Amino acid sequence: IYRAIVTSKFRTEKMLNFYNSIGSGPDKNTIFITFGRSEPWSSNENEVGFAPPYPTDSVLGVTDMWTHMMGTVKVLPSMLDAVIPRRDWGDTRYPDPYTFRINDIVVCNSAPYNATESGAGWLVYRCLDVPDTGMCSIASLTDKDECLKLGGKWTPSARSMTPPEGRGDAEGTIEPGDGYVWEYLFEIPPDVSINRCTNEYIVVPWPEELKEDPTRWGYEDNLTWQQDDFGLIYRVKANTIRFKAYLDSVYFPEAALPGNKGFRQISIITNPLEAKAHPNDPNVKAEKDYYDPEDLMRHSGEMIYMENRPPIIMAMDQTEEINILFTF
Amino acid sequence: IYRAIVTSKFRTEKMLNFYNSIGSGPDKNTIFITFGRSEPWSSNENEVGFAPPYPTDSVLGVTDMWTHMMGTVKVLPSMLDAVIPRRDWGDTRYPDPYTFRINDIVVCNSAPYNATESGAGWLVYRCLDVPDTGMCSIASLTDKDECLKLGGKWTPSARSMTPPEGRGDAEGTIEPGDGYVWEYLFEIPPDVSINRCTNEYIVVPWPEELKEDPTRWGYEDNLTWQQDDFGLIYRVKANTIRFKAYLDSVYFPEAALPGNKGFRQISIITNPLEAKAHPNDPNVKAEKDYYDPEDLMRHSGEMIYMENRPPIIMAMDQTEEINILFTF
Ligand SMILES: [Cl-]
Ligand SMILES: [Cl-]
Ligand SMILES: [Cl-]
Ligand SMILES: [Cl-]
Ligand SMILES: [Cl-]
Ligand SMILES: [Cl-]
Ligand SMILES: [Cl-]
Ligand SMILES: [Cl-]
Ligand SMILES: [Cl-]
Ligand SMILES: [Cl-]
Ligand SMILES: [Cl-]
Ligand SMILES: [Cl-]
Ligand SMILES: [Cl-]
Ligand SMILES: [Cl-]
Ligand SMILES: [Cl-]
Ligand SMILES: [Cl-]
């Protein structure tokens, strides 16, 4: 009777809501990362290939996380980046370095096999069309239009000759002539590619910082902002946030003593409350940038993420980077 | 290397993020609903059991929807209800009317075989414990404190014979004596039962409206806010929003006329832009409560939901109730 669905765009929207909800007051959320568990999982926890057991999503699991909690750190907006799968043009160290499909988002100018414009950071492009000669995900369909009309994924047999370059047409269209067609999307500045992007992911600017400094992301020429309001994240189906947070022992010396056993758990709690002199006292949203677990109220807030890992030892004046992915 | 997970609380979290993002302003989100398609799917449609085609999530699809436009109603938060599956205790109209399982939320005082307190509305409870004897529903793992000491689903046998009544102890805990234990949650006002709930779902109040009017939801004697801060939706694992929006034909005496073949498509768009005269102009966000398919900047905002189904007739000053379920 009923035939409905939610679009790919909704996924990007749940991501933005999450990112945008972070702030202060009763309508916003405060996000904290917790670290804990100084006692071993088992005597083999330090051997290569060791996997610790999965955390348990139950009231017991939450209680356990709190009982072993050693410290907490407030997560700020600037610690969160929207990201998408990284696909480098011409990287002959991975399959299909010269073959792509409609909608693939490829990165150029990020390695010698990519080089196209000394003076520009990494450059990202979306494939708009491919050669008419190839193979369809649905084998029997040997015609591109037929393939695509039925919903098959066409993979061309004619390789991409040269990597796209420049910002293309007034519409961003680029025609290398090898039968491929590309659309310039944006640029990634070095401070970002160098410290925020990884082997598997690239950053895609949030709408606000984009609208704020179009030139920083080589976006000054874009016109689509007249309709999609600098919604680059929706244009590329971004639906994953990556945290880049830090644990500074300077703030938890009592747990970074010369021979401590390290920490093995990480979790994310939204809106934990502050500790209270008397249970019936008013609730206070924890907003300082860090807390000793005992200065927070036990079991308050909502534990939305739980992670167990092999131990990692903290030194008196060192810092541990914590990364975490949220797919929406 | 790592073993992590997103807890079920994250789903409620996303649902609350969405509900909380709706408002007025750039950072805030506006949301409109749409409908259309006078064009028939085909002859064999007005029949019975005619499953229409599945919409298309691509520019090609959003294209059809926009063109076949007709009307657009703005959605207010008051039109959104966090809901959960309705399981009335003793409803022999459905499977297992007397057997329950931990974490199942059950409604009481909703029918004669349910009655426990006249003058009050539906009372809701959560199954804390279930009877000893039972089949773990996974290999063996059968006994008492076992299929539990390893997170194994549990389906008992010594059926529930007595509905839980009252508000339990200082923690809402209740023990009938049939090997079942329950926790008092809240109460639904008669007006909400009639107008918001259905044979399928019951409404669970948002934290804010719960903090503002506790007694209205049989919540005045509550104590758990001292840690969960009125986060009832989290307690019952609510992760679905049910739209309560009406299409008022008196808001348009054009498409509503005797001939009228009807419409067949539903659509939700977020943050749409008010059509401009000069593209380069600064974009404007629609903040009215209604717009004509041409009054808006085509392809503006973001389309997050598409629905196709049989035809529906629109009268003069008639109002067809439009409903939609979003699952986070
Ligand atoms: Cl997707
Ligand atoms: Cl948002
Ligand atoms: Cl539990
Ligand atoms: Cl919990
Ligand atoms: Cl920040
Ligand atoms: Cl290749
Ligand atoms: Cl950085
Ligand atoms: Cl935004
Ligand atoms: Cl797109
Ligand atoms: Cl406390
Ligand atoms: Cl498309
Ligand atoms: Cl309202
Ligand atoms: Cl039963
Ligand atoms: Cl009923
Ligand atoms: Cl609220
Ligand atoms: Cl327009």
Side-chain angles (χ1 to χ4, degrees):
Chain A
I1 304 76
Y2 290 115
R3 307 284 253 192
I5 48 74
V6 315
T7 60
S8 61
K9 305 311 160 64
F10 200 2
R11 302 192 68 179
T12 297
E13 179 135 331
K14 294 175 194 172
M15 178 181 80
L16 187 63
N17 291 337
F18 179 86
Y19 178 75
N20 274 326
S21 79
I22 302 182
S24 188
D27 41 3
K28 290 301 178 185
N29 301 311
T30 65
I31 282 71
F32 282 80
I33 285 174
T34 74
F35 70 90
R37 199 197 177 73
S38 68
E39 45 284 81
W41 288 120
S42 44
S43 62
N44 57 144
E45 67 179 354
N46 289 124
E47 303 177 9
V48 58
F50 172 76
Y54 283 78
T56 306
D57 180 6
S58 68
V59 179
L60 215 84
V62 173
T63 301
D64 151 72
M65 190 67 68
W66 273 92
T67 283
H68 294 68
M69 200 176 289
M70 279 162 55
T72 57
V73 177
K74 185 178 180 186
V75 163
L76 301 165
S78 59
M79 300 170 137
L80 314 180
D81 305 322
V83 302
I84 66 183
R86 169 168 175 186
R87 185 63 157 63
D88 274 10
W89 190 92
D91 188 355
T92 79
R93 308 175 299 174
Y94 296 140
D96 302 352
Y98 307 120
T99 298
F100 307 91
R101 303 73 175 301
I102 310 69
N103 289 306
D104 274 26
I105 307 179
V106 185
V107 176
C108 299
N109 200 45
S110 60
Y113 54 70
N114 253 318
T116 79
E117 180 177 349
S118 79
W122 298 10
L123 303 161
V124 192
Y125 300 95
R126 187 229 298 299
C127 176
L128 288 193
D129 194 10
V130 286
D132 308 315
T133 172
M135 176 56 67
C136 186
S137 55
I138 316 170
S140 52
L141 315 182
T142 62
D143 167 272
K144 176 184 185 294
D145 284 312
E146 162 194 38
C147 174
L148 285 54
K149 185 78 69 177
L150 287 188
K153 182 84 170 292
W154 189 266
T155 162
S157 47
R159 88 179 176 75
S160 189
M161 294 306 283
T162 264
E165 60 180 66
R167 301 179 181 185
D169 287 73
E171 45 175 353
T173 308
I174 293 176
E175 301 184 67
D178 52 16
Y180 283 84
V181 186
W182 303 94
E183 182 186 9
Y184 170 66
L185 297 175
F186 72 102
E187 180 179 349
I188 298 169
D191 69 279
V192 177
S193 63
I194 292 168
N195 305 291
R196 325 283 290 192
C197 301
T198 60
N199 72 115
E200 323 188 71
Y201 298 94
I202 63 184
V203 170
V204 181
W206 298 96
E208 197 59 41
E209 63 183 341
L210 187 55
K211 172 192 286 286
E212 166 77 288
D213 192 329
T215 181
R216 174 173 193 212
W217 304 83
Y219 210 71
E220 69 261 21
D221 288 343
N222 185 71
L223 299 314
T224 75
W225 64 269
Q226 304 175 302
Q227 65 167 181
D228 71 14
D229 209 52
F230 297 115
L232 181 69
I233 44 181
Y234 299 91
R235 300 182 63 194
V236 296
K237 305 194 189 296
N239 64 73
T240 304
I241 298 181
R242 179 171 188 268
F243 288 64
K244 196 163 199 290
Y246 296 97
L247 298 181
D248 191 344
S249 47
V250 166
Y251 291 98
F252 315 100
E254 80 287 351
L257 298 172
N260 80 85
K261 313 293 175 58
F263 80 104
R264 307 158 178 69
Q265 292 189 302
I266 290 297
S267 94
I268 290 179
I269 303 181
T270 59
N271 309 295
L273 300 177
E274 239 157 47
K276 282 148 60 176
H278 318 84
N280 214 63
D281 292 354
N283 291 336
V284 189
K285 185 97 80 64
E287 300 159 293
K288 300 185 181 63
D289 296 41
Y290 87 84
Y291 292 90
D292 170 303
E294 268 182 349
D295 284 315
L296 283 172
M297 183 198 286
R298 190 173 220 67
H299 248 293
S300 64
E302 297 296 343
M303 191 160 298
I304 62 172
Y305 175 92
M306 299 169 83
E307 174 186 313
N308 288 336
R309 49 213 260 171
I312 284 297
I313 59 304
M314 293 180 280
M316 54 180 87
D317 289 298
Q318 291 198 178
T319 287
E320 284 297 322
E321 171 170 42
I322 300 298
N323 302 116
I324 298 175
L325 311 160
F326 271 176
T327 300
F328 293 73
Chain B
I1 187 78
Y2 290 107
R3 259 73 181 297
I5 48 68
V6 300
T7 65
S8 60
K9 273 159 293 163
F10 198 8
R11 290 158 60 77
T12 299
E13 174 74 39
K14 297 178 203 174
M15 174 187 74
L16 184 68
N17 275 353
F18 179 93
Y19 176 69
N20 270 322
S21 74
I22 305 179
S24 32
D27 70 77
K28 286 297 180 184
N29 301 322
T30 56
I31 186 284
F32 298 77
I33 177 282
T34 67
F35 62 97
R37 175 177 287 286
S38 54
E39 176 187 62
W41 298 114
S42 62
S43 57
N44 53 97
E45 71 187 315
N46 327 76
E47 299 178 359
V48 57
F50 171 65
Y54 263 172
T56 21
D57 182 16
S58 52
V59 189
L60 95 82
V62 186
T63 290
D64 312 323
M65 196 69 63
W66 264 102
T67 46
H68 300 76
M69 259 271 250
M70 281 193 102
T72 70
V73 188
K74 177 181 189 180
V75 185
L76 298 175
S78 76
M79 289 173 216
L80 305 171
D81 293 327
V83 297
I84 64 178
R86 174 185 188 181
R87 178 81 148 73
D88 291 12
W89 186 108
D91 190 345
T92 75
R93 293 183 292 158
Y94 301 113
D96 290 347
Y98 298 98
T99 64
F100 300 104
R101 299 153 49 177
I102 291 176
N103 285 318
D104 273 357
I105 273 55
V106 192
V107 167
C108 273
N109 209 51
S110 74
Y113 54 83
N114 255 158
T116 62
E117 177 185 0
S118 48
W122 304 354
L123 301 172
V124 184
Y125 307 79
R126 172 218 273 161
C127 176
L128 293 189
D129 204 351
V130 291
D132 309 59
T133 61
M135 328 317 252
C136 190
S137 69
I138 33 177
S140 58
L141 307 176
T142 49
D143 193 81
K144 285 62 183 62
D145 315 312
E146 164 181 51
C147 179
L148 299 303
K149 193 75 174 185
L150 49 72
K153 188 67 62 179
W154 190 258
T155 303
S157 56
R159 300 199 299 281
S160 180
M161 195 199 99
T162 152
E165 69 195 355
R167 306 184 175 176
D169 60 5
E171 272 178 39
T173 62
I174 299 170
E175 298 188 60
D178 56 24
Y180 282 85
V181 171
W182 316 80
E183 182 189 10
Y184 169 65
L185 300 174
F186 67 104
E187 171 176 354
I188 304 174
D191 59 67
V192 173
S193 281
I194 297 181
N195 299 165
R196 318 291 274 177
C197 307
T198 72
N199 149 254
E200 311 296 48
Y201 291 112
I202 56 175
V203 171
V204 185
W206 298 104
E208 187 180 55
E209 67 182 347
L210 186 48
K211 199 155 186 160
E212 300 190 58
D213 201 343
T215 74
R216 183 190 184 215
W217 300 81
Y219 219 79
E220 76 264 38
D221 280 359
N222 179 267
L223 293 178
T224 64
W225 59 271
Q226 305 185 323
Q227 69 234 189
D228 68 13
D229 190 55
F230 301 106
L232 180 60
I233 47 171
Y234 287 95
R235 274 215 276 161
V236 304
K237 295 195 172 62
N239 59 58
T240 301
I241 293 183
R242 187 164 178 290
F243 282 66
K244 190 75 185 313
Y246 314 112
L247 291 181
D248 197 357
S249 298
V250 78
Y251 241 119
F252 62 92
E254 300 191 308
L257 293 164
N260 170 59
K261 286 67 67 179
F263 50 63
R264 302 155 172 62
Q265 301 188 313
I266 296 297
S267 163
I268 307 298
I269 299 173
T270 53
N271 292 300
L273 291 179
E274 258 179 293
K276 283 171 294 183
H278 309 300
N280 186 68
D281 275 306
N283 314 70
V284 190
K285 42 251 183 178
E287 279 183 50
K288 179 56 187 301
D289 319 307
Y290 186 99
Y291 280 99
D292 210 292
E294 189 190 308
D295 300 2
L296 297 177
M297 159 80 259
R298 191 193 286 80
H299 293 294
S300 66
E302 306 283 337
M303 185 167 288
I304 61 176
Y305 176 88
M306 316 175 103
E307 186 184 30
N308 294 316
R309 72 212 205 185
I312 290 300
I313 69 296
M314 60 186 106
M316 307 308 262
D317 294 15
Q318 190 70 169
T319 47
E320 247 286 350
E321 151 169 288
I322 285 296
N323 300 164
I324 290 146
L325 292 171
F326 277 176
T327 284
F328 300 71

